[PDB]
Amino acid sequence: DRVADVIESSIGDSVSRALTQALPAPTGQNTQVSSHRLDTGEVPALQAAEIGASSNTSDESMIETRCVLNSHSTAETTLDSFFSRAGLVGEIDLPLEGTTNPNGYANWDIDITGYAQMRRKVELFTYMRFDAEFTFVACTPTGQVVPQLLQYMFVPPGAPKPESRESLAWQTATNPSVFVKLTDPPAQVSVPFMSPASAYQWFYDGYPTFGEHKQEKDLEYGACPNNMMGTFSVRNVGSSKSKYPLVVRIYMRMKHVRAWIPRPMRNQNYLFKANPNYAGNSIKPTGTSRTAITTL
Amino acid sequence: EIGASSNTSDESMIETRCVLNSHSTAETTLDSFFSRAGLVGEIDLPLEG
Amino acid sequence: DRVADVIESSIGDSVSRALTQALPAPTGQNTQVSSHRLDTGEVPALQAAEIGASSNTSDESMIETRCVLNSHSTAETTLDSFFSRAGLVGEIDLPLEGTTNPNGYANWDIDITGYAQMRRKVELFTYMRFDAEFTFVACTPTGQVVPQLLQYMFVPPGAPKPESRESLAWQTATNPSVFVKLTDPPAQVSVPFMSPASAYQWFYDGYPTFGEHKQEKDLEYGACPNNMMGTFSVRNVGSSKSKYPLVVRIYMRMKHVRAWIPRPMRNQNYLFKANPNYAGNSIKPTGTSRTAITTL
Amino acid sequence: SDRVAQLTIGNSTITTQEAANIIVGYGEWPSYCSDDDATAVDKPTRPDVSVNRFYTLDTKLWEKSSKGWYWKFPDVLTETGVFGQNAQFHYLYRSGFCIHVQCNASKFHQGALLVAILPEYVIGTSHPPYKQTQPGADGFELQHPYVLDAGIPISQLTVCPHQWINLRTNNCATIIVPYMNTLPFDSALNHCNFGLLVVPISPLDFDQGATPVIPITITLAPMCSEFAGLRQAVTQ
Amino acid sequence: SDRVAQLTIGNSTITTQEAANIIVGYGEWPSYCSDDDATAVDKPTRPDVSVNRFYTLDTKLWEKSSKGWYWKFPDVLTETGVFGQNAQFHYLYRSGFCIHVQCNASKFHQGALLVAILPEYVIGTSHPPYKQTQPGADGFELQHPYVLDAGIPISQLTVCPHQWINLRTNNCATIIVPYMNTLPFDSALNHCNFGLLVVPISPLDFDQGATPVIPITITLAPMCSEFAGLRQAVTQ
Amino acid sequence: ETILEVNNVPTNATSLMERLRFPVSAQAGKGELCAVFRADPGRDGPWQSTMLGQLCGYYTQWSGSLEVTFMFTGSFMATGKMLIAYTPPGGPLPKDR
Amino acid sequence: SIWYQTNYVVPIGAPNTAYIIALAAAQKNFTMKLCKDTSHILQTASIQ
Ligand SMILES: CCCCCCCCCCCC(=O)O
Ligand SMILES: CCCCCCCCCCCC(=O)O
Ligand SMILES: [Ca+2]
Ligand SMILES: [Ca+2]
Ligand SMILES: [Ca+2]
Ligand SMILES: [Ca+2]
Ligand SMILES: [Ca+2]
């Protein structure tokens, strides 16, 4: 009744092998006493990185060490304890004069790859799942606190995006909006992990179209729709002119972080948003250079 | 022609597999829907007019 | 650990469903008493061959039958009881004068599709596994019994085939040979089912080469190597001339028969050997014709 | 509850409202190969759903003069779908089929189509070409239906897995056949285990005015597909 | 008993006499999809042996000046073998790989090749072409190996499943990687889960006279292959 | 289930009612194409008419299978057989039945 | 896509052309998440 092959076949194991278990580690490893040792067959120091493993040699087998009780905690080197720190990721400009944002409204695209500081850290991993808390600092180009009223409205991808300082879209009957005065403290907001994908993707090695991928369409390589959270709209609550030159700065902090695959840090200066393009005409060394490898 | 929505299930249509739907339906409820502030009124008390 | 799909999947059932069991049947079915019956809902006679099933209507439900004890045995309508009957399948000619078989020897190809009688019966099924018993009737074109000695040698496919009345191949150190006088009774031989295939194949709908199948190579369509049993050689045991005009006739009988798929009988006259080619220019009706379907 | 029916394999589903039931070739369901009937020492590939699914290929037009057509299963499917690939990449093949020849009409039409299966279907004519022996897709047509182009009477074809499509009753036939060959596996690239014949015994007739376009479609589906001897891709 | 080794998958077998052991990507073996991680409601196809086998594709020539090369797994294999077919016929894909980059030489040669894996390998340059992002077979070459053509330091690539081929010790590297993506399945026709980079950190050198033809071959093998969403055949 | 406007081409305002129906004549050839449409519910396609479609406009994402029943209104004497296919994402609009 | 498996067979005396109606709905395993204002319709003029 059974071909035996079907019985043996392990095909269908949703269970991953693992072979590596995560253990508790509040305090760094404590060093222990170590005396001299002179023998053959034992080569702690001798390794072969040609395998792809980080030398497992310990201090003890290298020098006559003493005993030390490492009380040094490793709680600040955790994900949350690291990423969970407010930082500039957005910045909108609603001036009185100019060509940038007239009319009194502004639709900002939801993307944080616009600022170094934050972008550097986050691009350390390949995937990342988490919630966040955004703070909104509204102010004039000088630091002047003005008695103006604004309305921040979130526009999910597929929702009607405001087209004017008085577009119908601002009724926000469904969308989430927030009204605040520049006199009141900044806006406090909590945002849940929203994405069709189980985790945000920093690097997308593929095309979202699935078409011909012509040259003129190479503008899509790297664009992942799972990171498209729609847009963010803001404007003054009025029918007339704003009367004031405003500038909103968006800050973000991450809560309940979950990073996965780790990759090399950034070596060059960022050029475009959501584009790992670098300064090819002038590349700089990862770090400082010397005059001779035999001189300090 | 009876006035009933076809009760045909995926299984009887194609050789399906097994899936554990964890997708919650708490946001598709009445309160979770209507309970959202929205513009419904607007008064104007100008100086001139 | 299991995707469930792997657990359910019946893939790997070497066991065939069957759904039809073979039962004992020495005597034909015995008829039983049957009285009249007049009712609705019961339509024994009414059938629908459009399904592909032979009407299961029985005599009883058709007419008021009596009781009969069928003693008629069905032992003569069995495979062995049928095929197990000697018949002409081969015929070699070793004349003194002529162009057919000079030199005194003859290599006959092992194939029975050369004679109607036998070929008709056997081609009733698609496959057939069995053993056989061959008889050899050697005699002159008149019926004259001559005091000549012969040597029948079987030459399996891949074995050295005799090229002359005195070829080295007749030493038959391995091959099976039989020496008989035309004065002694015919040769009695038992032959086991020898074939790479589990059963001889009467019809091979394909090509044995696996190449291009060009037109000049359409000479292979239908040729199955699993029916190629090599050749049969015969000659006079001497260095000089035979001194006599001989003609050997090969008869065969089947033992331990095992037929499988059944197909329609032969409708036309056989033309070629191992070729279902028919008389296309002049086709005849399966049977006799009448003058009118309303007249006998 | 005998005329209506549904067939579901892979990601395909068939329907009917005038079916005449299902026939199982020689009363036996498609089974895989036993670990004793096989000699090929290597775990074959049972892709299942990817190949064991319904494939609607060719279609023909029934006429008041049509003679008949035929196909060669093992070969027919090749070159199409995931199935074709395994058949071309692998050397050994094994599988059973579920055939569904549909052909509807109105209650004012009349006709009778015989749909039977014939194992090792060899043909004559003094040797037919490759385009006649293995007319895969779109099949081939019978010239002498009375002798099935093989010299055998068609009046005796019912002695094989068959079924009828009598327009006045049903509008489709369905047959199920298990692997058939004196061997466990065999390359379908050069050998066809059997063939399908569709011949009008009762000439399609109907009074003028009624849509004269009466198509006959063929839909089949592999079952218990097993392929062995993985090698380079071959065509014939 | 640590340098010698043998890999057997499908109907393929690999050998070595100077191996430096096997590394398992992030310490995890290729597993199938759980019935909760998947959303695709339909039993996928696990062809196994027919696709989960070793495929020797491209080969390159190491020189005293070579900069380095790279490939994009999901795409690389497509168009070749039974695997390619399922990848082109099906929409959803899932599988892990076993990579074996072999490159031998004599005891009189010297060189060090870094062979690492990089998930979601995106590249820059103001937008690279399709022939640069998905150079399937025969891969592509690095122009600025120091920044991996992405703006990231290679000096920090060891932070990923890697291994070295130091001619003075070993002559081949071997890595095993499980499916990697924020999703259960995903079409490999337009998205590459990761890429392979081979860069000479220690310039290949050798005194004149010794055979200067030092080839570097790439051989990979799918593991736990699962395909869903069967449809028409697609290429890109 | 709500009426799906596949035949949404007409917009005469006098022929807006035929957007709900669907044409099916007695062809002659083998393998005719009768209709084609997007499989996306919340898209501006034919799924605009369906209740389900209109609801989606109030949500950003979704999940689940979808059922679509087809009812023949032609005369009782009208017979036929048709192949309704669904080409999963990535597969371009087929040109052959 | 929709194709003709066979043909629209009709007797002598019945409409040579018929119609079909499509009804759409979601299965039980269907679930929506998040939300927003509809983009399927927009008011041109202000309510009077
Ligand atoms: C509502 C806040 C959600 C934050 C998600 C930010 C993700 C931006 C990543 C952009 C990457 C890209 O578009 O390829
Ligand atoms: C040793 C006696 C064996 C008898 C086997 C006879 C088989 C002949 C069939 C020939 C058919 C063909 O060659 O295609
Ligand atoms: Ca055709
Ligand atoms: Ca062919
Ligand atoms: Ca090459
Ligand atoms: Ca490609
Ligand atoms: Ca009419």
From TrEMBL, chains A, C:
This protein's source sits in the domain of life called Viruses
**Subcellular locations according to the entry:** Host cytoplasmic vesicle membrane; Host nucleus; Virion
Role description: Protein 2B: Plays an essential role in the virus replication cycle by acting as a viroporin. Creates a pore in the host reticulum endoplasmic and as a consequence releases Ca2+ in the cytoplasm of infected cell. In turn, high levels of cytoplasmic calcium may trigger membrane trafficking and transport of viral ER-associated proteins to viroplasms, sites of viral genome replication.
Quaternary structure, from the entry: Interacts with protein 3CD. Interacts with RNA-directed RNA polymerase.
Q: Which family does the similarity line name?
A: Belongs to the picornaviruses polyprotein family.
Could you tell me what this protein is called?
A: Genome polyprotein
Q: Which residues of the full protein are shown?
A: 567 to 862 of 2193
